Design a protein around this ligand. Structure first.
Ligand SMILES: *[C@@H]1O[C@H](CO)[C@@H](O[C@@H]2O[C@H](CO)[C@@H](O)[C@H](O)[C@H]2NC(C)=O)[C@H](O)[C@H]1NC(C)=O
Ligand SMILES: *[C@@H]1O[C@H](CO)[C@@H](O)[C@H](O)[C@H]1NC(C)=O
Ligand SMILES: *[C@@H]1O[C@H](CO)[C@@H](O)[C@H](O)[C@H]1NC(C)=O
Ligand SMILES: *[C@@H]1O[C@H](CO)[C@@H](O)[C@H](O)[C@H]1NC(C)=O
Ligand SMILES: *[C@@H]1O[C@H](CO)[C@@H](O)[C@H](O)[C@H]1NC(C)=O
Lengths: 238, 150, 100, 29, 100, 50
């Protein structure tokens, strides 16, 4: 069913598009807090693999999403204000050729061994369209979905692992796409045809940059007295 | 008095202004609306939405000599700063004594029974003669307009 | 007749304004504007390796010291144009009006 | 023998404590 | 638009007050004198101009200004004469009424 | 290091960059925003010198 909450130190992404070399940068942004409770949904979580029920989770100022799916059961993400076809919603679907991001008044078609059917085959009043190479094409497939001032920002990282779902190492997500969607994005339904969902909160992080502009470590300044000390001193060694 | 005094500051002035912005990489599809095999009737305007693109406004002036090229919300020289959000291009065939009625503040049967524009209007109305393309000696009876409305 | 109606919305797009670029001149003190980033400085070829994602570079302080050229994607360093104080060495006006 | 005729102790003291205006060149010299 | 620091067709091309301004701006609404159905002599506006007007600069010269890519003269619908004077009938509202 | 860092502060201004204030706003509002930045930078220099 839905599994017990797990403790992660993932969900760090580059907060901006600025290159920094061998510095520690203290920044205030929306991040998944370290050791926060991340819900683990165990294909389809509570629901079975052939059941059309869905958590349709609320999204609070952006989320962290991850899933290791060799068979690509999860095909997309739909974000919106009401998710009832009466207003605009954002449909992101990866068809293994291209990824299509559309803003339309989509009708809900009761979308889903490995059975497939048309997904959001009926929609009207379409206002936005974007197409790019696939987002996803044994990789963890980490994503951050954030929505600020009308711009819907997607960050991602694709690293392989077989033995465990999550590698023990640290990596930051890089921006994948930033679209002028404008949709309110109060809530979201996952599209299947086994995933983890965490939520971002305002936090201050100390981010360690390499000689090249990549983030190699991070300190969550509110996690522990030692982390707080590291942040006030702006050092990873105290 | 004898000594060393600090009186000002030397600065090397720039000699050029370099403005690098990305390859433009797009044309808003304005040309394809003006340049078409057939235009809509006046009663039912054919509306094309232009959005999420960069607009070269020189394509409008270079398309044809124009009967009327009047921009109301933004001066014809100030169209290049931006197209906020999206723009709607309504493409139709109208008579010469009817073109003069499509503008803010105007009245008449074509504006009132076929399609009206607001009086507080942001946009531009562009018209050109199409006698070469739409007229026939047998007579072009494909276009329609409304003369009477409730 | 084509009627161009410009809808005034709160949506984030407002995108169509064309942007006119100039040629890129390096190793001279110039004013510049790179994708809205403005300043004065000397642009030189950089040895920094920006990620395909990164567009700008900064110092330990927030002074910008590098940009990605939007058309060539070359990374350029920004050196401040020469500046410094001036001191005048005077023997004294009761001796000589020659100064250094 | 040194490029600067400092004592061994002076050379140590200078090595232990740590025209390009590399730092804070924002009107400050 | 008759105020320091303002922009618009008047502040930009017909009449501009300096940003550092001492004085009083008095607007008198008198429709009985300046509003006739046939039009009103007292109106005039600049349509297109090469540059913005300076404070208290009085530009009383006219020549055809082309908004297109080719020279022309007098072709109102194609290019514009500096004068785009409009009249005013008593039937129009407060935002259109003449003010002294 | 602190004094240079102070150049990034807004001190109540719309932005820390004078060119953005001048490009986005009309002259008198821009002057208000510039005085807000001048007060902040001048106070930072007075602090440094003291
Ligand atoms: C930073 O990026 C460079 C290039 O991607 C990495 O590669 C090294 O670059 C230096 C440059 O002087 C070379 O001398 C090395 O031989 C390169 N190594 C390899 C394996 O090609 C560099 O390692 C990166 N820095 C860090 C800290 O990861
Ligand atoms: C934290 O995660 C580790 C695995 O990385 C796990 O063994 C440990 O039990 C977790 N602690 C809590 C309180 O969930
Ligand atoms: C989220 O959705 C609800 C649906 O009723 C809407 O009222 C709310 O305004 C949305 N969020 C925002 C930030 O508008
Ligand atoms: C812009 O076009 C030039 C050729 O004119 C090409 O060399 C360059 O790579 C292009 N840049 C982008 C970002 O498309
Ligand atoms: C001045 O520049 C020259 C090269 O142009 C360099 O050799 C010299 O060392 C510089 N001055 C100083 C004090 O280093």
């Amino acid at each position: 069913t839905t599994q017990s909450y797990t403790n992660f130190t993932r969900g760090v992404y580059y907060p901006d598009k600025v290159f920094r070399s061998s510095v520690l940068h203290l920044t205030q942004d929306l991040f998944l807090p370290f050791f926060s409770n991340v819900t683990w949904f165990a294909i389809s979580g509570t629901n079975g693999t052939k059941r059309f029920d869905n958590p349709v989770l609320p999204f609070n100022d952006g989320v962290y999403f991850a899933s290791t799916e060799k068979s690509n059961i999860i095909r997309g993400w739909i974000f919106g204000t009401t998710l009832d076809s009466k207003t605009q919603s954002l449909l992101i679907v990866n068809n293994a050729t291209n990824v299509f991001i559309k803003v339309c008044e989509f009708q809900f078609c009761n979308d889903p061994m490995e059975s497939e059917s048309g997904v959001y085959s009926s929609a009207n009043n379409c206002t936005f369209e974007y197409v790019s190479q696939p987002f996803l094409m044994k990789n963890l497939r980490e994503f951050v979905f954030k929505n600020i001032d009308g711009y819907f920002k997607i960050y991602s990282k694709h690293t392989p692992i077989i033995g465990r779902d999550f590698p023990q190492g640290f990596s930051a997500l890089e921006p994948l796409v930033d679209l002028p969607i404008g949709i309110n994005i109060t809530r979201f339904q996952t599209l299947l045809a086994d995933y983890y969902v965490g939520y971002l909160q305002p936090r201050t992080f100390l981010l360690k940059y390499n000689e090249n502009g990549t983030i190699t470590d991070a300190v969550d300044c509110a996690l522990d007295p030692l982390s707080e000390t590291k942040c006030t001193l702006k050092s990873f060694t105290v | 008095e004898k000594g060393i005094y600090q009186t000002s500051n030397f600065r090397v002035q720039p000699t050029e202004s370099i403005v690098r912005f990305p390859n433009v990489t797009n044309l808003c599809p304005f040309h394809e609306v003006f340049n078409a095999t057939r235009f809509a009737s006046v009663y039912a305007w054919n509306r094309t939405r232009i959005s999420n693109c960069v607009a070269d406004y020189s394509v409008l002036y270079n398309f044809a000599p124009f009967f009327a090229f009047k921009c109301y919300g933004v001066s014809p020289t100030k169209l290049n700063d931006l197209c906020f959000t999206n723009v709607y291009a309504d493409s139709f065939v109208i008579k010469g004594n009817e073109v003069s009625q499509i503008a803010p503040g105007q009245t008449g049967n074509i504006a009132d029974y076929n399609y009206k524009l607001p009086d507080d209007f942001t946009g531009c109305v562009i018209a050109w003669n199409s006698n070469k393309l739409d007229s026939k000696h047998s007579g072009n009876y494909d276009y329609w307009y409304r003369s009477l409305r409730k | 007749v084509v009627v161009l109606s410009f809808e005034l919305l709160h949506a984030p797009a407002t995108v169509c304004g064309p942007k006119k670029s100039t040629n890129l001149v390096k190793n001279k003190c110039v004013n510049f504007n790179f994708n809205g980033l403005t300043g004065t400085g000397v642009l030189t070829k950089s040895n920094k390796k920006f990620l395909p994602f990164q567009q700008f570079g900064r110092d330990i302080v927030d002074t910008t010291d590098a940009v990605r050229d939007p058309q060539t994607l070359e990374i350029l360093d920004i050196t401040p144009c020469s500046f410094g104080g001036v001191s005048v060495i005077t023997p004294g006006t009761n001796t000589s009006n020659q100064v250094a | 023998s040194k490029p600067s005729k400092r004592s061994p102790i002076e050379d140590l003291l200078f090595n232990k404590v740590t025209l390009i205006c590399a730092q804070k060149f924002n009107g400050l010299t | 638009q008759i105020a320091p620091g303002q922009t618009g067709n008047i502040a930009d091309y017909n009449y501009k007050l300096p940003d550092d301004f001492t004085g009083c701006v008095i607007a008198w609404n008198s429709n009985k004198l300046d509003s006739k159905h046939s039009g009103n002599y007292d109106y005039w506006y600049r349509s297109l101009r090469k540059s913005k007007l300076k404070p208290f600069e009085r530009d009383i010269s006219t020549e055809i200004y082309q908004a297109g890519n080719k020279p022309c003269k007098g072709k109102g619908p194609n290019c514009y004469f500096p004068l785009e004077s409009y009249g005013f009938r008593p039937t129009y509202g407060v935002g259109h009424q003449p003010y002294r | 290091n602190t004094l240079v860092k102070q150049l990034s502060s807004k001190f109540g201004a719309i932005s820390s960059v004078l060119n953005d204030i001048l490009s986005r706003l009309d002259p008198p509002e821009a002057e208000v925003q510039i005085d807000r930045l001048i007060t902040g930078r001048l106070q930072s220099l007075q602090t440094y010198v003291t």
